[PDB]
Design a protein around this ligand. Structure first.
Ligand SMILES: O=S1(=O)O[C@@H]2[C@H](CO)[C@@H](O)[C@H](O)[C@@H](O)[C@@H]2O1
Ligand SMILES: [Ca+2]
Length: 768
């Protein structure tokens, strides 16, 4: 490998061999059907709300999130980079698709598949990823850096449906070598959303832009229709000319054929026919190809950028609503703007690389932090773009704001699940705070919505009211229904009786004020009525008059199957913290009566929480369950947020420290030797709590949250040891193969529940 000298991959990048077979992979541990797309994954391409495309470490464009809210795992085999090389003095060259695999649909048999093992590496430090190609039969070594411009505090380029592929080629040999690099792409108009005639009317065009020092050649893959539907728009691929390369292209090859129309050209001399052909297709699938050819002398390096864009301006949800995607603010809504997006990328990618470096540098340069932590911190961020992210720029057919939503996950297809976002929204408040405040305003606006229509609760078959006035919703809808319009899509349980949602809501509001500098009084004023309503409504659920809402021994908080009854450490502590936050907001907004009342409620509740739950070593799980003395990893969730919010001690420092040390000693170190995170419940005899499946699970996002709480309490070693098990399981050779699909949970056997999950974004709470 002579090429990793010529590029700049950070040591904290996650790495795997191209074509590597992973032997330990985990699978779902539930009986019901659940997504398992395998370990062949990579860092995604695409901005927020753009739809994303997962290109895997084997090279294939395989995890398709272009239909907003959906996960479709299928490799589109035509979509590839290929190489040709010919050593000066040899009669023939060699051509090779850079894909460690071969088609499963019978097509493109003429292409040279099966990129060999042990001949290159994949690296990822989101939003960047790289491939290196170090192959005994390719004398010129190649690398590519691929990315989308995902940039904190930037709401423009971060939205773009674009990717850049910056190639580097180096000749370590003593002979001249002819080299070509070819990007192929299928005209994917009709891949989803089109109910009949999926290819019909698709056509490809070639654009040559000859600006001084900025020559671009691109293919635009569109459809003859001007219909404004989710399916219609354009793809584009292209390249920018650099000194010493030439460009060639082929506008139309058939993807539902053997591929030789293209490949016989490429395999001869690495030069395409430059044949333009705008004829629309009927049934056949079609594609385009853009190539560069160059001669490298001994010792020579050259760099050349390609790009990909997708202008699919409309997202449709299953309940019928159609919305424009965010990037249309910058490029237009008519679906005929792929070239403009591509051109912007090819002309500005160096500036985008610097912007990414500038944001990653403070962390990367901090030599106190281990590399593994950096690997996880950056790579968990994949989910912000990959989680079905919806970011609207108007309803189709007809505002100041752009509504936003991130899915909980794909298996549980709910936008912004609040009990989860309490953990998973750290990166948004830290890095894209304007989006975070918009989401919270969305929740504020729902507080007094009432929908008295009844739904059947999935778990027990009881009927319940959809939305109760004064109760925060579980979620802002489903991609299968109507995001932002119809809330509480979740029906497996009744969230109107949950005991955590209203307290978490208030905590999130105050967090969002504190972590953006304690200056945004207008945000506190917008949300204040909803905060007061939320706490007042939750107070009504205190049936024994101890000042604390009572868990009911039935599904009533985020651990939906783990029954809490009476006062719980979890809900009780969140309540205490939410009261303290609201007192503070009352002081800021000069609402005396609120300050007065929430202080009184706090003092009573604090005294009783401590009396009811403090056992001398830790806080009991609850007051009334058979499992009341379980040690819960999340028992002091409210004090964790109180630390972040700078609200001081809700519980005594000594008792918090004892409890955290107990959780480390038990839930971490007695669970598979502390190598897999914090199990949720452990009995005081050191045996995992078997009262419910959730007690026997590690929750990745709970464990990262626990690690930040330990860190803030000076338990540095325990904090990183605790987090390390989650990193190991996710990313390491000894783990279970969950990279770019971190799950909610795993059991002690390492098998998982709910891949591609929002909660582990809580790792960013370790950077507070
Ligand atoms: O009912 S679920 O399967 O439970 C999931 C998690 C627990 O893993 C809950 O916290 C969340 O509120 C639910 O929307 C999910 O659907
Ligand atoms: Ca009570």
């Amino acid at each position: 490998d002579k090429i990793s000298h010529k590029i700049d991959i950070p040591d904290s990048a996650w790495t795997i061999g191209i074509g590597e077979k992973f032997k330990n992979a985990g699978h779902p541990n539930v009986k019901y059907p659940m997504i398992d797309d395998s370990y062949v994954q990579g860092a995604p391409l695409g901005g927020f709300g753009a739809g994303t495309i997962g290109r895997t470490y084997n090279g294939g464009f395989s995890r398709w999130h272009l239909e907003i809210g959906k996960n479709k795992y299928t490799t589109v085999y035509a979509n590839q980079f290929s190489v040709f090389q010919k050593v000066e003095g040899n009669k023939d060259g060699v051509a090779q698709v850079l894909y460690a695999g071969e088609p499963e649909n019978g097509y493109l048999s003429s292409w040279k598949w099966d990129y060999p093992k042990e001949s290159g590496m994949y690296y990822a430090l989101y939003p960047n990823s790289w491939y290196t190609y170090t192959n005994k039969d390719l004398p010129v070594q190649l690398a590519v850096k691929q990315f989308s411009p995902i940039i904190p505090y930037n709401y423009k380029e971060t939205s773009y449906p674009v990717a850049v592929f910056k190639w580097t080629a180096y000749n370590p040999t003593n002979k001249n070598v002819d080299v070509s690099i070819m990007f192929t792409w299928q005209n994917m108009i009709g891949f989803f959303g089109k109910q009949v005639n999926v290819n019909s009317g698709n056509f490809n065009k070639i654009i040559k832009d000859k600006s001084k020092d900025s020559e671009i050649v691109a293919a635009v893959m569109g459809n003859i229709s001007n219909d404004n539907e989710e399916w219609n728009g354009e793809y584009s691929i292209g390249v920018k000319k650099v000194p010493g390369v030439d460009i060639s292209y082929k506008a139309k090859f058939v993807t539902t054929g053997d591929g030789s129309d293209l490949w016989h050209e490429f395999s001869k001399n690495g030069i395409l026919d430059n044949k333009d052909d705008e004829t629309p297709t009927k049934q056949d699938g079609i594609g385009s190809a853009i190539a560069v050819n160059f001669k490298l002398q001994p010792g020579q390096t050259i760099e050349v950028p390609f790009a990909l864009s997708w202008d699919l301006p409309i997202m449709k949800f299953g309940g019928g609503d159609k919305w424009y995607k965010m990037y249309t603010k910058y490029f237009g809504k008519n679906g005929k703007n792929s070239f403009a997006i591509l051109k912007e990328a090819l002309n500005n990618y160096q500036k985008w690389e610097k912007m990414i470096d500038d944001w990653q540098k403070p962390i990367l340069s901090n030599k106190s932090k281990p590399d593994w932590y950096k690997t996880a911190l950056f790579n968990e961020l994949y989910y912000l773009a990959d989680g079905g992210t919806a970011w609207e720029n108007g309803k189709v057919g007809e505002r100041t704001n752009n509504m936003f939503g991130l899915l909980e996950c794909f298996d549980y297809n709910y936008y912004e699940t609040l009990d989860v976002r309490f953990y998973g929204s750290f990166p948004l408040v830290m890095l894209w705070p304007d989006i975070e405040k918009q989401v919270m305003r969305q929740f504020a606006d729902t507080i007094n919505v009432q929908d008295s229509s009844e739904f059947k609760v999935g778990s027990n078959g009881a009927m319940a009211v959809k939305k109760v006035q004064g109760m925060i919703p579980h979620d802002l809808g489903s991609s299968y229904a109507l995001p932002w319009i119809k809330i509480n899509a979740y029906d497996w349980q009744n969230p109107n009786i949950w005991k955590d949602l209203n307290s978490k809501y208030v905590l999130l509001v105050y967090r969002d004020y504190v972590l953006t500098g304690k200056t945004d009084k207008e945000f506190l004023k917008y949300t204040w009525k909803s905060v007061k309503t939320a706490l007042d409504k939750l107070k009504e659920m205190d049936k024994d008059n101890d000042g604390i809402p009572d868990n009911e021994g039935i599904p009533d908080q985020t651990y939906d199957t783990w029954s809490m009854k009476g006062t719980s450490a979890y809900c009780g502590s969140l309540w205490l913290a939410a009261l303290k936050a609201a007192q503070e907001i009352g002081k800021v907004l000069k609402d005396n009566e609120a300050y007065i009342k929430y202080n009184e409620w706090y003092k009573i509740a604090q005294q009783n929480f401590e009396k009811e739950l403090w056992n001398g070593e830790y806080y009991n799980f609850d007051t009334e369950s058979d499992h009341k003395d379980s040690i819960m990893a999340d028992q002091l969730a409210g004090q964790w947020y109180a630390d972040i919010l700078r609200l001081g001690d809700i519980l005594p420092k000594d008792h918090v420290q004892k409890a955290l040390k107990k959780i480390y000693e038990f839930n971490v170190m007695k669970f598979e030797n502390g190598k897999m995170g914090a199990v949720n419940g452990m009995r005081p005899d050191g045996i995992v709590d078997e009262s419910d499946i959730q007690a026997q699970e590690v929750w990745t996002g709970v464990t990262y949250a626990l690690a930040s709480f330990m860190k803030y309490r000076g338990m540095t070693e325990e904090a990183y040891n605790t987090a390390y098990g989650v990193y190991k399981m996710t990313y390491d050779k000894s783990g279970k193969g969950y990279w770019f699909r971190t799950p909610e949970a795993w059991t002690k056997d390492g098998n998982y529940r709910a891949s591609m999950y929002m909660r582990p974004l809580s790792i960013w709470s370790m950077e507070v």
